[PDB]
Amino acid sequence: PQPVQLRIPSYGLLKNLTWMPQERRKPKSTEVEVQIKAVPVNFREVLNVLGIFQEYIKKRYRSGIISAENLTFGVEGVGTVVAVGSDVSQWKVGDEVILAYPGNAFSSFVICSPDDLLAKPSDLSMVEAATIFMSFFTAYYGLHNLAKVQPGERVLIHAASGGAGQAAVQLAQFFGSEVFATTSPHKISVLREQGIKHVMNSRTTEFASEVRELTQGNGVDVIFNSLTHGEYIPKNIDILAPGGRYIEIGRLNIWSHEQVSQRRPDVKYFPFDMSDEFVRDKQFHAKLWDDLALLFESGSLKPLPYKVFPSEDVVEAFRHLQHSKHIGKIVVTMP
Ligand SMILES: NC(=O)c1ccc[n+]([C@@H]2O[C@H](COP(=O)([O-])OP(=O)(O)OC[C@H]3O[C@@H](n4cnc5c(N)ncnc54)[C@H](OP(=O)(O)O)[C@@H]3O)[C@@H](O)[C@H]2O)c1
């Protein structure tokens, strides 16, 4: 293929996403070159293009220099090793891999470290495997590592139609918990068909009174939230059961630990940003995959629902997510 990389000239409009020409490089002695086959759009990246959330992680910028014209996209993806640095033993040409937080997976070729790659589950297609990394790693870290969901507990999952939400539903049910889901009105029927008993409208905070009624005022043990505008944070805090665990993956206008404690001192509050975690420790993703890989191997977890767009339609792929037309993941295939 003609090497390209997805870029923008400035912030504010999806239509300015552009496939910019790139040189083909060779890997240095401890690098690996991966030809990308499938790369999904993440909601953060929509916010990035629109100028709503500005990346500070330097890995998201060419040369580590922060500016719109240097911003790259693709916080996860899948592909095939096509060249290996001379001194690398861990990978070989033809290996199929998941890229862990590359930051530039919307590129024809990515050069990275061997420790930035994970073995793709062999029985999944590239597009199927492209649904896994960010959504499941986020949901697993929150539900398992932080909140420690137990069988029988009541777990409220907001925006359960989206990528993180769909992964969280699968994981919560794998852990034997009772899922309460919210989604937009026209997606409720879809989530009920997936087998969720309790599905409510996410587009107002009236779900809180509905949860109170369903639980006879007891509330829920765990909340997995990304909706931070309006009164969504305090309304969620108020429907936590005694000692409930509040997982927050939204990053705009979130409360501090002290603010949450003022309202409910018994609640355990778990805000986090996976991008920060990945940069902090490269063993973090490796240890999560040690737990998750076998679940995808066995079929205990399954790929998310997805919709494919070819690379030439990348603007429409981003718009599909912006307008929230989806269930699961939006996956872009490369030529
Ligand atoms: N902290 C972290 O490490 C981390 C990691 C991954 C994602 N996130 C964040 O978690 C969220 C999920 O990301 P994603 O990439 O998987 O995207 P996504 O969930 O597939 O898409 C965004 C979701 O937001 C919901 N939504 C947006 N505005 C809403 C509103 N006003 N009322 C109700 N629902 C609304 C949509 O609901 P409908 O489907 O009902 O339209 C949609 O499901 C995003 O906010 C993202 O920034 C954080």
Side-chain angles (χ1 to χ4, degrees):
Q2 311 144 347
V4 290
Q5 179 171 83
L6 191 66
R7 300 288 278 281
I8 55 172
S10 56
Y11 294 123
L13 294 181
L14 298 183
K15 71 191 273 181
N16 293 321
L17 283 160
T18 304
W19 288 110
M20 290 298 280
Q22 297 281 278
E23 300 293 317
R24 188 73 188 274
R25 297 182 179 183
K26 298 189 155 289
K28 294 175 182 62
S29 68
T30 66
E31 296 178 330
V32 181
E33 188 184 36
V34 181
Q35 185 172 355
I36 303 300
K37 302 293 166 71
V39 43
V41 187
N42 281 270
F43 192 70
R44 173 69 73 84
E45 295 169 318
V46 174
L47 301 181
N48 291 156
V49 176
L50 294 176
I52 296 167
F53 189 102
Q54 188 174 110
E55 293 298 306
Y56 56 83
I57 286 174
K58 288 189 163 177
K59 196 181 192 183
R60 287 292 304 286
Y61 297 94
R62 296 304 302 267
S63 291
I65 295 175
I66 297 175
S67 73
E69 66 185 30
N70 294 350
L71 185 65
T72 63
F73 305 90
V75 296
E76 57 178 323
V78 298
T80 307
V81 175
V82 291
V84 182
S86 63
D87 296 19
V88 171
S89 54
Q90 184 176 350
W91 300 108
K92 68 195 185 294
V93 170
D95 288 343
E96 297 182 341
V97 294
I98 294 166
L99 299 89
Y101 197 63
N104 62 344
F106 281 103
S107 300
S108 307
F109 299 93
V110 169
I111 296 180
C112 63
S113 156
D115 295 340
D116 297 314
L117 299 177
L118 299 169
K120 179 182 150 289
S122 61
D123 294 331
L124 299 182
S125 71
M126 290 286 176
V127 164
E128 282 176 320
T131 73
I132 295 174
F133 182 83
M134 189 61 79
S135 299
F136 283 91
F137 283 50
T138 298
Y140 187 84
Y141 184 60
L143 294 169
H144 176 269
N145 290 45
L146 299 181
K148 302 180 184 176
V149 170
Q150 301 297 302
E153 291 188 310
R154 301 156 155 167
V155 179
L156 176 63
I157 301 170
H158 288 295
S161 38
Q166 283 277 292
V169 171
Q170 285 197 44
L171 281 162
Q173 299 200 315
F174 171 74
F175 294 138
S177 68
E178 186 180 15
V179 170
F180 294 70
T182 74
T183 187
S184 296
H186 73 286
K187 303 184 188 187
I188 290 175
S189 62
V190 178
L191 275 45
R192 293 180 179 152
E193 292 196 7
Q194 293 187 321
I196 310 173
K197 184 170 86 191
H198 295 310
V199 186
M200 295 160 282
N201 182 14
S202 61
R203 291 272 169 181
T204 74
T205 60
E206 290 310 308
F207 69 80
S209 67
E210 197 165 356
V211 166
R212 277 200 193 81
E213 209 158 313
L214 289 167
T215 65
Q216 303 264 97
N218 183 243
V220 292
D221 303 299
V222 179
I223 297 174
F224 185 88
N225 190 42
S226 65
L227 305 179
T228 63
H229 59 286
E231 298 183 340
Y232 279 75
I233 293 169
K235 286 273 169 35
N236 274 304
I237 292 167
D238 290 348
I239 62 174
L240 287 161
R245 298 96 76 193
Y246 171 19
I247 307 161
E248 183 57 70
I249 70 172
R251 302 298 294 176
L252 308 167
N253 308 116
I254 64 175
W255 290 24
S256 70
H257 285 81
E258 294 68 33
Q259 291 163 350
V260 175
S261 180
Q262 175 184 43
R263 193 175 189 88
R264 281 287 295 284
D266 59 299
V267 157
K268 312 302 187 287
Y269 178 44
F270 297 112
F272 62 94
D273 186 327
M274 294 293 282
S275 65
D276 290 336
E277 298 294 331
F278 295 138
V279 171
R280 176 182 174 280
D281 183 358
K282 287 206 175 169
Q283 291 305 309
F284 178 76
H285 68 254
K287 293 182 281 181
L288 291 171
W289 194 233
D290 287 337
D291 290 0
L292 286 165
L294 66 93
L295 302 180
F296 286 99
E297 281 303 310
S298 68
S300 288
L301 298 175
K302 302 271 197 276
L304 304 184
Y306 62 79
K307 183 175 172 74
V308 172
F309 290 78
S311 60
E312 66 271 18
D313 296 340
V314 65
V315 170
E316 291 307 317
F318 275 65
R319 280 179 175 151
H320 193 86
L321 187 52
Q322 179 194 22
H323 294 327
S324 210
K325 298 180 169 189
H326 66 308
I327 305 287
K329 209 78 183 183
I330 300 156
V331 178
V332 176
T333 53
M334 296 294 283

